[PDB]
Amino acid sequence: MKEEAVRVIEEVLKQGRTAMVEYEAKQVLKAYGLPVPEEKLAKTLDEALEYAKEIGYPVVLKLMSPQILHKSDAKVVMLNIKNEEELKKKWEEIHENAKKYRPDAEILGVLVAPMLKPGREVIIGVTEDPQFGHAIMFGLGGIFVEILKDVTFRLVPITEKDARKMIQEIKAYPILAGAEEPADIDAIVDMLLKVSKLVDDLKDYIKEMDLNPVFVYNKGEGAVIVDSRIILKPK
């Protein structure tokens, strides 16, 4: 069990919380070498302005709050912020939106991240079954994920064989192979194995989680995790 992960996890539980906010989840992910790009947690608008200049515009602002896990629903995530004036106004907006959504929300800060180059959207999920333990799922992302109902699964821990196999079993597999340039399958295989390892190590800690969205680029150029959620088990 990578100590850094257990540390961030314990810290959250110590606060009597089960749901981890995006930046906390990603700390767990990074501790296992998963592809999470550099992002900074601003506690003030001045801090955000600094970090923005640091990572370079355009940037994304995402309000962090244990009470506001579904950021898009609350509208506390603002994209493609091109400059300092716009960042100052979007900073005000997300706080207002969070106030209308959950006025009693604890605001942990605002995540300042980069505008990642889009790629093939995929989703990696993890749930725990009462009888079989943790399972890892894979399928394409997009806004029609619930309509297409195309996900494959395997029990954790999985082998590389399981990983390559579950990737090929989805109906949308031909799309990844390029129906066109094929996506970076090996990169996906690596993510599945790392999540499998992370979950196996922390099986007594994590109830469920997912990496959504994840962008997968063409062959040989890896992938990147855009958002993630981790739900911890109590006591």
Listed in order, the ranges of the chain carrying CATH 3.30.1490.20 are 38-115
Architecture of domain 1-37+116-235: 2-Layer Sandwich (3.30)
Architecture of domain 38-115: 2-Layer Sandwich (3.30)
Method: X-ray
Measured between alpha carbons, how far is 60 from 39 in angstroms, rounded to an integer?
A: 10
**Residue 78 structure tokens:** 């603002």
Measured between alpha carbons, how far is 188 from 144 in angstroms, rounded to an integer?
A: 21
Q: Resolution limit in angstroms?
A: 2.0
3-state helix vs strand vs coil in the chain, percent to 5: 40, 30, 35
**What is the residue-wise DSSP string for 91-152?**
HHHHHHHHHHH-TT----EEEEEE-PPP-EEEEEEEEEETTTEEEEEEEE-STTHHHH--EE
Residues in the chain: 235
